[PDB]
Amino acid sequence: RTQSSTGTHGGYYYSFWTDNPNTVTYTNQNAGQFSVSWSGNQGNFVGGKGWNPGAARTIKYSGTYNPNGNSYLAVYGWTRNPLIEYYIVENFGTYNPSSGATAAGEVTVDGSVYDIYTSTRTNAPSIEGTRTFQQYWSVRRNKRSSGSVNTGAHFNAWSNVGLALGSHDYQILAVEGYYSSGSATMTVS
């Protein structure tokens, strides 16, 4: 029992995925706004709004993030040629989502140091099906729930660690939860 909802709403790309539709409700709202509520400490979900294709852009986000347990708030996206999955993690709960990734330095931008990591996913699900691909992570030290993200600064930092990002696929400001509860409303511009 899985559910994936993607498209364009309010003039923005949106994406919402869950493996337990009964414990999470995603609401597409006006312009770049979305809400999510999750409850029952059951299921994995990721959802939010942004762009497809992504770019080196400034992502402004404003809202309220009220998690309880394992959850994060991140700019999240993909490239192809090469296939890359990336995360700019602005806030997280009781689990650091980069756990197990390899430390790869620091970038200071938008009012915080971010710790950089890289990792490899082997024979794993992706936007292209089962693939082996690289991940990049920037994890914000100064956790926050509103601000602006200079994605180009991160992309540049990652390009000084390993292979560079490819041609952009989707790019969203996402809320994720894993067997937890919470709610959030975010507006992306």
mmCIF file with all atom_site columns, all heavy atoms in Angstrom, residues 135-147:
data_model
loop_
_atom_site.group_PDB
_atom_site.id
_atom_site.type_symbol
_atom_site.label_atom_id
_atom_site.label_alt_id
_atom_site.label_comp_id
_atom_site.label_asym_id
_atom_site.label_entity_id
_atom_site.label_seq_id
_atom_site.pdbx_PDB_ins_code
_atom_site.Cartn_x
_atom_site.Cartn_y
_atom_site.Cartn_z
_atom_site.occupancy
_atom_site.B_iso_or_equiv
_atom_site.pdbx_formal_charge
_atom_site.auth_seq_id
_atom_site.auth_comp_id
_atom_site.auth_asym_id
_atom_site.auth_atom_id
_atom_site.pdbx_PDB_model_num
ATOM 1   N N   . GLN A 1 135 ? 25.057 10.019 -3.235 1.00 0.00 ? 135 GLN A N   1
ATOM 2   C CA  . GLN A 1 135 ? 24.290 10.973 -2.466 1.00 0.00 ? 135 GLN A CA  1
ATOM 3   C C   . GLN A 1 135 ? 25.235 12.032 -1.933 1.00 0.00 ? 135 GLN A C   1
ATOM 4   O O   . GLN A 1 135 ? 26.364 11.733 -1.519 1.00 0.00 ? 135 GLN A O   1
ATOM 5   C CB  . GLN A 1 135 ? 23.627 10.297 -1.265 1.00 0.00 ? 135 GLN A CB  1
ATOM 6   C CG  . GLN A 1 135 ? 22.642 9.197  -1.600 1.00 0.00 ? 135 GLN A CG  1
ATOM 7   C CD  . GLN A 1 135 ? 22.138 8.501  -0.360 1.00 0.00 ? 135 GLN A CD  1
ATOM 8   O OE1 . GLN A 1 135 ? 22.923 7.897  0.358  1.00 0.00 ? 135 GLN A OE1 1
ATOM 9   N NE2 . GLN A 1 135 ? 20.821 8.555  -0.111 1.00 0.00 ? 135 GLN A NE2 1
ATOM 10  N N   . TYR A 1 136 ? 24.752 13.274 -1.876 1.00 0.00 ? 136 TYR A N   1
ATOM 11  C CA  . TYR A 1 136 ? 25.387 14.354 -1.136 1.00 0.00 ? 136 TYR A CA  1
ATOM 12  C C   . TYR A 1 136 ? 24.447 14.860 -0.055 1.00 0.00 ? 136 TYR A C   1
ATOM 13  O O   . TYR A 1 136 ? 23.233 14.961 -0.259 1.00 0.00 ? 136 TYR A O   1
ATOM 14  C CB  . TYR A 1 136 ? 25.748 15.527 -2.053 1.00 0.00 ? 136 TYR A CB  1
ATOM 15  C CG  . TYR A 1 136 ? 26.946 15.274 -2.943 1.00 0.00 ? 136 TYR A CG  1
ATOM 16  C CD1 . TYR A 1 136 ? 26.823 15.181 -4.322 1.00 0.00 ? 136 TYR A CD1 1
ATOM 17  C CD2 . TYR A 1 136 ? 28.204 15.130 -2.397 1.00 0.00 ? 136 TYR A CD2 1
ATOM 18  C CE1 . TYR A 1 136 ? 27.924 14.933 -5.127 1.00 0.00 ? 136 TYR A CE1 1
ATOM 19  C CE2 . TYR A 1 136 ? 29.311 14.913 -3.188 1.00 0.00 ? 136 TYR A CE2 1
ATOM 20  C CZ  . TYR A 1 136 ? 29.166 14.805 -4.554 1.00 0.00 ? 136 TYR A CZ  1
ATOM 21  O OH  . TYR A 1 136 ? 30.294 14.551 -5.310 1.00 0.00 ? 136 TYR A OH  1
ATOM 22  N N   . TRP A 1 137 ? 25.048 15.201 1.084  1.00 0.00 ? 137 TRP A N   1
ATOM 23  C CA  . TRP A 1 137 ? 24.339 15.772 2.209  1.00 0.00 ? 137 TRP A CA  1
ATOM 24  C C   . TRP A 1 137 ? 25.049 17.035 2.672  1.00 0.00 ? 137 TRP A C   1
ATOM 25  O O   . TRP A 1 137 ? 26.277 17.050 2.800  1.00 0.00 ? 137 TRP A O   1
ATOM 26  C CB  . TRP A 1 137 ? 24.392 14.804 3.406  1.00 0.00 ? 137 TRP A CB  1
ATOM 27  C CG  . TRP A 1 137 ? 23.967 13.410 3.125  1.00 0.00 ? 137 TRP A CG  1
ATOM 28  C CD1 . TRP A 1 137 ? 24.706 12.409 2.526  1.00 0.00 ? 137 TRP A CD1 1
ATOM 29  C CD2 . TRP A 1 137 ? 22.718 12.828 3.447  1.00 0.00 ? 137 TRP A CD2 1
ATOM 30  N NE1 . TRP A 1 137 ? 23.978 11.258 2.440  1.00 0.00 ? 137 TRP A NE1 1
ATOM 31  C CE2 . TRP A 1 137 ? 22.753 11.480 3.007  1.00 0.00 ? 137 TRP A CE2 1
ATOM 32  C CE3 . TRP A 1 137 ? 21.554 13.317 4.039  1.00 0.00 ? 137 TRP A CE3 1
ATOM 33  C CZ2 . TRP A 1 137 ? 21.673 10.615 3.156  1.00 0.00 ? 137 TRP A CZ2 1
ATOM 34  C CZ3 . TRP A 1 137 ? 20.474 12.450 4.187  1.00 0.00 ? 137 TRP A CZ3 1
ATOM 35  C CH2 . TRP A 1 137 ? 20.542 11.117 3.726  1.00 0.00 ? 137 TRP A CH2 1
ATOM 36  N N   . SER A 1 138 ? 24.267 18.076 2.979  1.00 0.00 ? 138 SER A N   1
ATOM 37  C CA  . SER A 1 138 ? 24.699 19.209 3.801  1.00 0.00 ? 138 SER A CA  1
ATOM 38  C C   . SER A 1 138 ? 23.749 19.266 4.985  1.00 0.00 ? 138 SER A C   1
ATOM 39  O O   . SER A 1 138 ? 22.539 19.407 4.785  1.00 0.00 ? 138 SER A O   1
ATOM 40  C CB  . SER A 1 138 ? 24.614 20.524 3.045  1.00 0.00 ? 138 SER A CB  1
ATOM 41  O OG  . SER A 1 138 ? 25.618 20.607 2.060  1.00 0.00 ? 138 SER A OG  1
ATOM 42  N N   . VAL A 1 139 ? 24.278 19.164 6.210  1.00 0.00 ? 139 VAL A N   1
ATOM 43  C CA  . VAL A 1 139 ? 23.418 19.118 7.393  1.00 0.00 ? 139 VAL A CA  1
ATOM 44  C C   . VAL A 1 139 ? 23.666 20.363 8.233  1.00 0.00 ? 139 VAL A C   1
ATOM 45  O O   . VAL A 1 139 ? 24.776 20.572 8.756  1.00 0.00 ? 139 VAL A O   1
ATOM 46  C CB  . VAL A 1 139 ? 23.654 17.833 8.207  1.00 0.00 ? 139 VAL A CB  1
ATOM 47  C CG1 . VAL A 1 139 ? 22.734 17.782 9.415  1.00 0.00 ? 139 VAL A CG1 1
ATOM 48  C CG2 . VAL A 1 139 ? 23.466 16.600 7.330  1.00 0.00 ? 139 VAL A CG2 1
ATOM 49  N N   . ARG A 1 140 ? 22.633 21.203 8.352  1.00 0.00 ? 140 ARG A N   1
ATOM 50  C CA  . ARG A 1 140 ? 22.767 22.482 9.036  1.00 0.00 ? 140 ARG A CA  1
ATOM 51  C C   . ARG A 1 140 ? 22.994 22.286 10.529 1.00 0.00 ? 140 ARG A C   1
ATOM 52  O O   . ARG A 1 140 ? 22.209 21.610 11.200 1.00 0.00 ? 140 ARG A O   1
ATOM 53  C CB  . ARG A 1 140 ? 21.510 23.316 8.809  1.00 0.00 ? 140 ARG A CB  1
ATOM 54  C CG  . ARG A 1 140 ? 21.671 24.780 9.172  1.00 0.00 ? 140 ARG A CG  1
ATOM 55  C CD  . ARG A 1 140 ? 20.395 25.568 8.915  1.00 0.00 ? 140 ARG A CD  1
ATOM 56  N NE  . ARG A 1 140 ? 20.497 26.931 9.427  1.00 0.00 ? 140 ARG A NE  1
ATOM 57  C CZ  . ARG A 1 140 ? 20.953 27.988 8.763  1.00 0.00 ? 140 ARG A CZ  1
ATOM 58  N NH1 . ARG A 1 140 ? 21.351 27.923 7.499  1.00 0.00 ? 140 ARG A NH1 1
ATOM 59  N NH2 . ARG A 1 140 ? 21.039 29.146 9.397  1.00 0.00 ? 140 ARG A NH2 1
ATOM 60  N N   . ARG A 1 141 ? 24.042 22.918 11.080 1.00 0.00 ? 141 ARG A N   1
ATOM 61  C CA  . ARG A 1 141 ? 24.237 22.887 12.526 1.00 0.00 ? 141 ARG A CA  1
ATOM 62  C C   . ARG A 1 141 ? 23.177 23.701 13.264 1.00 0.00 ? 141 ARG A C   1
ATOM 63  O O   . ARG A 1 141 ? 22.648 23.266 14.290 1.00 0.00 ? 141 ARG A O   1
ATOM 64  C CB  . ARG A 1 141 ? 25.612 23.379 12.921 1.00 0.00 ? 141 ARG A CB  1
ATOM 65  C CG  . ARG A 1 141 ? 26.709 22.450 12.471 1.00 0.00 ? 141 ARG A CG  1
ATOM 66  C CD  . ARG A 1 141 ? 28.030 22.830 13.074 1.00 0.00 ? 141 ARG A CD  1
ATOM 67  N NE  . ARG A 1 141 ? 29.074 21.991 12.551 1.00 0.00 ? 141 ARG A NE  1
ATOM 68  C CZ  . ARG A 1 141 ? 30.366 22.270 12.621 1.00 0.00 ? 141 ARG A CZ  1
ATOM 69  N NH1 . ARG A 1 141 ? 30.817 23.371 13.227 1.00 0.00 ? 141 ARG A NH1 1
ATOM 70  N NH2 . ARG A 1 141 ? 31.215 21.421 12.072 1.00 0.00 ? 141 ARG A NH2 1
ATOM 71  N N   . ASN A 1 142 ? 22.890 24.905 12.770 1.00 0.00 ? 142 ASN A N   1
ATOM 72  C CA  . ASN A 1 142 ? 21.922 25.792 13.407 1.00 0.00 ? 142 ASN A CA  1
ATOM 73  C C   . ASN A 1 142 ? 20.539 25.449 12.897 1.00 0.00 ? 142 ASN A C   1
ATOM 74  O O   . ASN A 1 142 ? 20.014 26.092 11.982 1.00 0.00 ? 142 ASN A O   1
ATOM 75  C CB  . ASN A 1 142 ? 22.241 27.254 13.114 1.00 0.00 ? 142 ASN A CB  1
ATOM 76  C CG  . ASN A 1 142 ? 23.510 27.713 13.772 1.00 0.00 ? 142 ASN A CG  1
ATOM 77  O OD1 . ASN A 1 142 ? 23.885 27.188 14.813 1.00 0.00 ? 142 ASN A OD1 1
ATOM 78  N ND2 . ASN A 1 142 ? 24.169 28.719 13.186 1.00 0.00 ? 142 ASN A ND2 1
ATOM 79  N N   . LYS A 1 143 ? 19.938 24.406 13.480 1.00 0.00 ? 143 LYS A N   1
ATOM 80  C CA  . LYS A 1 143 ? 18.629 23.941 13.040 1.00 0.00 ? 143 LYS A CA  1
ATOM 81  C C   . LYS A 1 143 ? 17.648 25.113 12.972 1.00 0.00 ? 143 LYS A C   1
ATOM 82  O O   . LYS A 1 143 ? 17.642 25.984 13.847 1.00 0.00 ? 143 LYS A O   1
ATOM 83  C CB  . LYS A 1 143 ? 18.095 22.879 14.001 1.00 0.00 ? 143 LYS A CB  1
ATOM 84  C CG  . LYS A 1 143 ? 18.861 21.564 13.979 1.00 0.00 ? 143 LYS A CG  1
ATOM 85  C CD  . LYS A 1 143 ? 18.301 20.603 15.017 1.00 0.00 ? 143 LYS A CD  1
ATOM 86  C CE  . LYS A 1 143 ? 19.020 19.265 15.057 1.00 0.00 ? 143 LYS A CE  1
ATOM 87  N NZ  . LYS A 1 143 ? 18.354 18.354 16.028 1.00 0.00 ? 143 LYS A NZ  1
ATOM 88  N N   . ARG A 1 144 ? 16.808 25.131 11.932 1.00 0.00 ? 144 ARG A N   1
ATOM 89  C CA  . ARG A 1 144 ? 15.834 26.200 11.757 1.00 0.00 ? 144 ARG A CA  1
ATOM 90  C C   . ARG A 1 144 ? 14.673 25.699 10.925 1.00 0.00 ? 144 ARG A C   1
ATOM 91  O O   . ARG A 1 144 ? 14.732 24.642 10.299 1.00 0.00 ? 144 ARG A O   1
ATOM 92  C CB  . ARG A 1 144 ? 16.477 27.429 11.107 1.00 0.00 ? 144 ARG A CB  1
ATOM 93  C CG  . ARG A 1 144 ? 16.923 27.187 9.675  1.00 0.00 ? 144 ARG A CG  1
ATOM 94  C CD  . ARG A 1 144 ? 17.534 28.433 9.082  1.00 0.00 ? 144 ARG A CD  1
ATOM 95  N NE  . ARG A 1 144 ? 17.963 28.167 7.716  1.00 0.00 ? 144 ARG A NE  1
ATOM 96  C CZ  . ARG A 1 144 ? 18.333 29.090 6.832  1.00 0.00 ? 144 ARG A CZ  1
ATOM 97  N NH1 . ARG A 1 144 ? 18.404 30.366 7.180  1.00 0.00 ? 144 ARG A NH1 1
ATOM 98  N NH2 . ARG A 1 144 ? 18.635 28.708 5.603  1.00 0.00 ? 144 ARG A NH2 1
ATOM 99  N N   . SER A 1 145 ? 13.598 26.493 10.896 1.00 0.00 ? 145 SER A N   1
ATOM 100 C CA  . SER A 1 145 ? 12.362 26.118 10.244 1.00 0.00 ? 145 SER A CA  1
ATOM 101 C C   . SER A 1 145 ? 11.827 27.195 9.289  1.00 0.00 ? 145 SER A C   1
ATOM 102 O O   . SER A 1 145 ? 10.700 27.106 8.840  1.00 0.00 ? 145 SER A O   1
ATOM 103 C CB  . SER A 1 145 ? 11.335 25.702 11.314 1.00 0.00 ? 145 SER A CB  1
ATOM 104 O OG  . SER A 1 145 ? 11.789 24.494 11.951 1.00 0.00 ? 145 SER A OG  1
ATOM 105 N N   . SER A 1 146 ? 12.646 28.210 8.999  1.00 0.00 ? 146 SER A N   1
ATOM 106 C CA  . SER A 1 146 ? 12.347 29.210 7.982  1.00 0.00 ? 146 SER A CA  1
ATOM 107 C C   . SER A 1 146 ? 13.664 29.877 7.610  1.00 0.00 ? 146 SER A C   1
ATOM 108 O O   . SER A 1 146 ? 14.568 29.993 8.443  1.00 0.00 ? 146 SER A O   1
ATOM 109 C CB  . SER A 1 146 ? 11.334 30.252 8.494  1.00 0.00 ? 146 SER A CB  1
ATOM 110 O OG  . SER A 1 146 ? 10.031 29.704 8.717  1.00 0.00 ? 146 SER A OG  1
ATOM 111 N N   . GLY A 1 147 ? 13.769 30.312 6.356  1.00 0.00 ? 147 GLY A N   1
ATOM 112 C CA  . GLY A 1 147 ? 14.950 31.004 5.903  1.00 0.00 ? 147 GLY A CA  1
ATOM 113 C C   . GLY A 1 147 ? 15.116 30.902 4.413  1.00 0.00 ? 147 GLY A C   1
ATOM 114 O O   . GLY A 1 147 ? 14.153 30.641 3.696  1.00 0.00 ? 147 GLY A O   1
#
